[PDB]
Amino acid sequence: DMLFPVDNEARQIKELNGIWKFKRDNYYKQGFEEKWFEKPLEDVIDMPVPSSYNDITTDQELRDHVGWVWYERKFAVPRLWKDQRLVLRFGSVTHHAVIYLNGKEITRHKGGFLPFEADVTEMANEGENRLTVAVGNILEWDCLPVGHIEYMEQKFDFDFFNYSGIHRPVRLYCTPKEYIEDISVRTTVDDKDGMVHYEIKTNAEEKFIKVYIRDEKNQVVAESNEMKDMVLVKDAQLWQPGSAYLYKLDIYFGQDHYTLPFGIRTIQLTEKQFLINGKPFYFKGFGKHEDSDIRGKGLDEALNVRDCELLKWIGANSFRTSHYPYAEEMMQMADQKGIVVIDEVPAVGMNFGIFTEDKVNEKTLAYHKQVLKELYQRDKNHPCVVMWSITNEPHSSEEASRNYFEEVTKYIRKLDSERPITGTMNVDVEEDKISQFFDVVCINRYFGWYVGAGKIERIYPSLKTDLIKWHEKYGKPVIVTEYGADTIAGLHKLPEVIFSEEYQKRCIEENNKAMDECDFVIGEHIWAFADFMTAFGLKRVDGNKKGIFTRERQPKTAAFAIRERWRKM
């Protein structure tokens, strides 16, 4: 159960963000061994929430910390909340969490990009309470993303910096004691009329319920007293790429009230095309990252609006939540703005034998299924999500990866029968062993950068040849999910050279020429949207510089050429 918290006459949200008190372990698990949670934290600094902690201070030891840190603040339960159900919700804690309330452990969570909560109805006191949160950043072979510890040094083979902290809002909220627990909505369209199938779960299934479907002007277009039903919406306003329309499932249950936005739209994959509402859709966009200056991966809604303005300005129609689920506020924004989304779990870093019993094994596999279940439960009702990505660049040349990903793909297909399934490729087409389980083949190709760096004339023939091989081996439509080139803003050269602004434009141009000659390509996603931070390395100039925009969300030269192309499509 993970309905996004709401405010109305019956439910209320208390934000617990702001400035917390903060302290890091000075040796491994110092805070657990010394039971720091038993009393208020001492010798602390201020830390903002939501935000990563790595980039806030001037202290390299905190930036490079491996292990656990400790957050604490106080919150109040109002007298007016006397007989309500009380829930403490964490949008995320990266990567591992132990939650304490007034010195007592109340829940734990594993995985840094999905929300979790704890019912504290019978444990919070009226008035002041103390909330203590332990935050661990260690990744092992059974975490997603994958990593491992060497002797303590953290190892991993994904790009982005392993930021840690409380990256999403913390919320204490209240509901009545009999209440709506979960909602699932599915839609179909028969010519001009839409059919809304819904299922509502409550903790008193025998009690009366009233369910409205309201349109965008909030007028009732359908009505029912069933917990599960199938209601017709005549002349349905469809949710379309670039023109969102959102209905509302408005539910009254006893004293409870919940309103759920949703969209009516169909997805159908053909030979060679990706149909949305029966019309072909060509992905134009980026894989993104949750990353900006100072705050690391902290949610920043102002930055989120600026990014959507940028996506609109440049003619993009989609993005992929590259390498982990994003904040729901961004998923909600994509629903409202009509932006098409590929939603991805953090199965990244399964690459360098990786699929062995001592590394990525059945323990990893079972956790991977759990993350997919948690992702599906959070995002199942978003019309913006049109496809699930279950992995980014696994070492899928290994024979052992075949049974691994057949199992993951079949699990996600049972949870959701309506949305296509995918995963992104980096191994050579001849050696790949899993893409036959997918509905769409997604490839990350860096011709002109990681292959034949600087050789502009080799980009077009190399990509076209590889594209044709992927189509011929699997017979499915293809998206190029990553391609591009590192580019230092202000570095100009004539003739162009790698890292120059001119080279990034030409590299992308030549890849685009290959894709334009292939009738089976259904998308191009440039890597990356914006410069972002990476673990330190000699190929990373203060992070990954493949951004079309700088980290401060201003365009490099190539942005203007991309805009001309995407806007005339």
Catalytic residues: 393, 482
**CB of 494 vs a second copy, minimal distance in Å:** 21
Tell me which of 1, 19, 410, 431 binds a second copy, using CB under 8 A: 19
Based on the shown chain and the rule CB under 8 A, indicate whether residue 12 belongs to the binding site for a second copy. Answer: yes
Based on the shown chain and the rule CB under 5 A, indicate whether residue 374 belongs to the binding site for Ca ion. Answer: no
Based on the shown chain and the rule CB under 5 A, indicate whether residue 328 belongs to the binding site for Ca ion. Answer: yes
441 in Cβ contact with 479 (< 8 Å): yes
Q: State which residue, 216 or 431, has the beta carbon closest to a second copy.
A: 216
Q: Which does 327 bind (CB under 5 to 8 A by kind): Ca ion, a second copy, none?
A: Ca ion
**CB of 482 vs a second copy, minimal distance in Å:** 25
Structure-block tokens of residue 142: 């059974």
Q: State which residue, 99 or 479, has the beta carbon closest to Ca ion.
A: 99
Taking CA 268 as the corner, what is the angle to CA 211 and CA 185, rounded to the nearest 5 degrees? 15
Based on the shown chain and the rule CB under 8 A, indicate whether residue 295 belongs to the binding site for a second copy. Answer: yes
Helix (H, G, I), strand (E, B) or coil at 523: strand
Q: State which residue, 85 or 168, has the beta carbon closest to Ca ion.
A: 168
- Could you tell me which residues come within 8 angstroms of residue 350 by beta carbon, excluding any fewer than 6 positions away? 146, 360, 391, 393, 394, 395
Q: Cα separations (Å) of 506 from 109, 349, 463, 510, 545?
A: 46, 30, 14, 6, 16
Contact pattern from residue 478 through residue 517 relative to a second copy, giving x for each residue in contact according to CB under 8 A and a dash for the rest: ----------------------------------------
Q: Which of the ranges 121-129, 184-192, 356-364, 449-457 carries the binding residues for a second copy, by CB under 8 A? A: 121-129
Could you identify the residue written with the tokens 């089976």?
Answer: 520
DSSP string for residues in 68-127: EEEEEEEEEE-GGGTTSEEEEEES--BSEEEEEETTEEEEEEE-SSS-EEEE-TTTSPSE
**CB of 290 vs a second copy, minimal distance in Å:** 14
Residues 86-115 that bind Ca ion (CB under 5 A): 91
Q: Which does 416 bind (CB under 5 to 8 A by kind): Ca ion, a second copy, none?
A: none
| Of 245, 180, 251, residue with least CA distance to 210 | 251
Based on the shown chain and the rule CB under 5 A, indicate whether residue 368 belongs to the binding site for Ca ion. Answer: no
Based on the shown chain and the rule CB under 8 A, indicate whether residue 18 belongs to the binding site for a second copy. Answer: yes
Residues 31-90 that bind a second copy (CB under 8 A): 46-48, 51, 55-58, 75-81, 84
What's the rounded Cα separation, in Å, for the pair 236 and 221?
A: 10
Based on the shown chain and the rule CB under 8 A, indicate whether residue 119 belongs to the binding site for a second copy. Answer: no
Cis peptide upstream of residue 145 (ω within 30 degrees of 0): yes
What's the rounded Cα separation, in Å, for the pair 97 and 92?
A: 9
508 in Cβ contact with 468 (< 8 Å): no
DSSP string for residues in 187-242: EEEETTEEEEEEEEEES-TTS-EEEEEE-TT--EEEEE--SEEEEEETT----BTT
Residue 233 pairs in a beta bridge with: 194
Helix (H, G, I), strand (E, B) or coil at 524: strand
Based on the shown chain and the rule CB under 8 A, indicate whether residue 339 belongs to the binding site for a second copy. Answer: no
**CB of 501 vs a second copy, minimal distance in Å:** 16
Contact pattern from residue 173 through residue 212 relative to a second copy, giving x for each residue in contact according to CB under 8 A and a dash for the rest: -x--------------------------------------
Q: Which does 51 bind (CB under 5 to 8 A by kind): a second copy, Ca ion, none?
A: a second copy
- Burial label for 388, CB within 10 Å (0-12, 13-18, 19+), is buried
Tell me which of 9, 357, 430, 457 binds a second copy, using CB under 8 A: 9
The 10 Å Cβ neighbour count of residue 362 is 11
Q: State which residue, 165 or 423, has the beta carbon closest to a second copy.
A: 165
**CB of 96 vs a second copy, minimal distance in Å:** 22
Q: Which does 564 bind (CB under 5 to 8 A by kind): a second copy, Ca ion, none?
A: none
Q: State which residue, 522 or 562, has the beta carbon closest to a second copy.
A: 562
78 in Cβ contact with 173 (< 8 Å): no
What's the rounded Cα separation, in Å, for the pair 520 and 53?
A: 44
Q: Is 517 annotated as a binding residue?
A: no
**CB of 417 vs a second copy, minimal distance in Å:** 32
Q: State which residue, 14 or 473, has the beta carbon closest to a second copy.
A: 14
Count residues near Ca ion (CB under 5 A).
4
| Phi-psi category of residue 499: left, alpha or beta, with phi > 0 → left and psi -120 to 50 → alpha | left
Q: Which does 406 bind (CB under 5 to 8 A by kind): a second copy, Ca ion, none?
A: none
Query: Which contacts of 536-544 are long-range, i.e. CB under 8 A and separated by 24 or more positions?
Result: 541/486, 541/488, 543/161, 544/159, 544/160, 544/486
Q: Is 328 annotated as a binding residue?
A: yes
Q: Which of the ranges 106-114, 333-341, 367-375, 497-505 carries the binding residues for a second copy, by CB under 8 A? A: 333-341
Residues 166-225 that bind Ca ion (CB under 5 A): 168
| Of 485, 502, 484, 480, residue with least CA distance to 493 | 502
Could you identify the residue written with the tokens 């080279």?
Answer: 503
**CB of 56 vs a second copy, minimal distance in Å:** 6
| Of 185, 189, 179, 457, residue with least CA distance to 335 | 185
Binding site for a second copy (CB under 8 A): 7-15, 18-19, 46-48, 51, 55-58, 75-81, 84, 126-128, 174, 293-295, 298, 301-306, 308-310, 312-313, 329, 333, 336-337, 552-553
Binding-site positions read: 328-329
Binding residues for Ca(2+): 328-329
Which residues are near Ca ion by CB under 5 A?
91, 168, 327-328
